Amino acid sequence: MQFLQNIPPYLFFTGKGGVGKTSISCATAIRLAEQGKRVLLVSTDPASNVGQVFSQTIGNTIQAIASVPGLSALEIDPQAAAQQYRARIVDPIKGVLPDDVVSSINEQLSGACTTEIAAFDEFTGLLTDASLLTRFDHIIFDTAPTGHTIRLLQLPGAWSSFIDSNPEGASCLGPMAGLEKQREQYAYAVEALSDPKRTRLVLVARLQKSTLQEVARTHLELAAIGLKNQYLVINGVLPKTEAANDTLAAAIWEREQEALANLPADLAGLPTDTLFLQPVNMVGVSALSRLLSTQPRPDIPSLSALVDDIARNEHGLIMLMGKGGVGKTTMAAAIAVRLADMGFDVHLTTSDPAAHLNNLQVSRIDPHEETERYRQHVLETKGKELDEAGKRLLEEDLRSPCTEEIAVFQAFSRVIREAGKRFVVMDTAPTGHTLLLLDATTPMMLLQDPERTKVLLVTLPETTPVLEAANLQADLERAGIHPWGWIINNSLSIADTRSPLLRMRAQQELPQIESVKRQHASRVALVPVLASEPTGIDKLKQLAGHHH
Ligand SMILES: Nc1ncnc2c1ncn2[C@@H]1O[C@H](COP(=O)(O)OP(=O)(O)O)[C@@H](O)[C@H]1O
Ligand SMILES: Nc1ncnc2c1ncn2[C@@H]1O[C@H](COP(=O)(O)OP(=O)(O)O)[C@@H](O)[C@H]1O
Ligand SMILES: [Cl-]
Ligand SMILES: [Cl-]
Ligand SMILES: [Cl-]
Ligand SMILES: [Mg+2]
Ligand SMILES: [Mg+2]
Ligand SMILES: [Sb+3]
Ligand SMILES: [Sb+3]
Ligand SMILES: [Sb+3]
């Protein structure tokens, strides 16, 4: 693998939940240790499962890994880091300022943005500890900071700037107050990340048109900041051999192939490697090492069943939630089509420009134009009296992932009024953290009401995807919102295929589909992987399955 050659001391893997960052990190680490290298593998995930892959316990202390001489490990709990980042800011004012005021400050330090900044404070310490490079040849991270987090830290206004105590509170700048270290150490960490002789960044992706576009954008954001030592690793690729004697497998192999040849322009110049889809989720060293090779029914109702029950009261707000790319826009469209086809009045709203298109009206809003309106608004409102460096800090705050989630939700709110006379289906929504923040100043009670509103969480039958969905649900629950049901999309165990490998992946999904049914959701739906893309009504009608 090109990405495995002549690696510098720091190696970072980035990419969406579940693409294989940790798996690839572990396998890499083993490979390196076996070439006689001293390796430090830093586990950075919220519910670290790395100890498990090496059959041993790991902690916030560097411990050598028994089964792999040369390799040591370190767990940096992000939830815990955020919790402590939060405590350092709030404890001083507990019993000083009034409870509702402190409680409000605490909520500002409870979003993904704070977690991200806290993580960076942890990376920073590692990236600045010179002695570590005295003990290790390589330090590997299974996540990477985002362009937004890095830009925030490189802004002069982040140090010399007091933004009128976020009143309306559209702000996530609260976290900055918690920066433990000296401006200089973060600056250094950033140079270390931008230095190709020190840091190598691995973009992990899947051979799916959508993901590839997201990775492309990630690549541009990071290169623009100075991280130009980048490698792309396409994981989970279906080996052609398998396209033999199977409509599904041959069709998937076919779609990946197209995409492999029509990689988005911005990624074509990057060193690209591909890792083949393995039959069993890697649990040990043998399994992990196999990943770098160069050569190769659950009892859950159909989506129709969920629409069936949603239909029961003739109207309401149906909100689809979940991480990016899990299928919210697709599910939202399917649900809207079924309702419509059964004589109901449906108004489907979307933040994505793409839908074929009668008692089914579609409103598509443009995320970019809504974001800019919202940004304009928050600028004339909070930006006055701020010097230029302060305004740029605020503009970067308005580049947080939630900025867009708030502005689109804002717009969707025009039609959220129709959920009283008909069905309104939305394909996205803000986090519980954001809702609480917005409510501080927005139809909160409406969202909270079990009748008027049913929130659906979309996820995949995979470990990380389910955990991220559970976390998205926990957060919503804090905002007084209980997801009405979960939809497990892209399932193979509910699809028709004789591909031995595919049947093996489908069996791998069993435990995941099980934990959703008994530990996370009350009402659950299974949707098969359709092969090809569900671009039109026909296909969109196939995802649902049938009645009774
Ligand atoms: N090429 C592959 N083929 C089959 N399984 C894989 C592959 N890559 C990862 N996985 C399996 O997928 C899950 C996805 O996870 P992980 O690698 O933890 O990714 P991330 O760190 O990006 O969430 C695990 O259950 C894992 O062992
Ligand atoms: N069950 C499925 N079978 C095949 N492709 C699917 C399925 N669900 C989603 N996809 C495909 O996946 C992408 C995942 O996307 P999308 O539904 O846009 O979601 P989100 O709004 O969650 O980002 C699109 O390329 C899409 O058409
Ligand atoms: Cl946030
Ligand atoms: Cl936050
Ligand atoms: Cl942030
Ligand atoms: Mg991981
Ligand atoms: Mg979408
Ligand atoms: Sb945010
Ligand atoms: Sb926030
Ligand atoms: Sb932010």
Curated annotation (Swiss-Prot):
Sorted UniProt keywords = Arsenical resistance, ATP-binding, Nucleotide-binding, Plasmid, Translocase
| Ligand binding (ATP) | 15-22, 322-329
Matching InterPro entries, A to Z? AAA+_ATPase, Anion-transp_ATPase-like_dom, Ars_ATPase, ATPase_ArsA/GET3, P-loop_NTPase
Q: Name one GO molecular function term.
A: ATPase-coupled arsenite transmembrane transporter activity
Task: Extract the Pfam families matched here.
Answer: ArsA_ATPase
Q: Which residues form a coiled coil?
A: none
> Is Aminoacyl-tRNA synthetase one of the keywords?
no
Stated EC number for the protein is 7.3.2.7
Which reactions fall under this protein's catalytic activity? arsenite(in) + ATP + H2O = arsenite(out) + ADP + phosphate + H(+)
Q: Does the keyword Nucleotide-binding apply?
A: yes
SMART domains from the entry?
AAA (SM00382)
Q: Which family does it belong to?
A: Belongs to the arsA ATPase family.
Q: What does this protein do?
A: Anion-transporting ATPase. Catalyzes the extrusion of the oxyanions arsenite, antimonite and arsenate. Maintenance of a low intracellular concentration of oxyanion produces resistance to the toxic agents.
NCBIfam families per the UniProt record, alphabetical: arsen_driv_ArsA, GET3_arsA_TRC40
Q: What is this protein called?
A: Arsenical pump-driving ATPase
Q: Which organism is it from?
A: Escherichia coli
